[PDB]
Amino acid sequence: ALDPLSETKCTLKSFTVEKGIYQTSNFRVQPTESIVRFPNITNLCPFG
Amino acid sequence: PVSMTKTSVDCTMYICGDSTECSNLLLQYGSFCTQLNRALTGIAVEQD
Secondary structure (H helix, E strand, O other), X not given: OOOHHHHHHHHHOOOXXXXXXXXXXXXXOXXXXXXXXXXXXXXXOOOO | OOOOOXXXXXXXXXXXXXXXXXXXXXXXXXXXXXXXXHHHHHHHHHHO
């Protein structure tokens, strides 16, 4: 959980990683906020 | 023909995309999807 070298160590299940290139599950960017979109409906109720 | 397209499928993003419960449930299945991704990477490197 510190550096990608230790991440590859966890990946290969070995304390010694050879010369090469590897990784694990992808890192995804999370949404910053939520945007609600709904109509501007003009028809009102004639409670008046 | 000499080589095929180098497809790479992320098992976690496919089965349990943006969820924790299904990933925790799949964690009980061992290393199935991980070894499938490793076989896919081997297919890619042998195509190369």
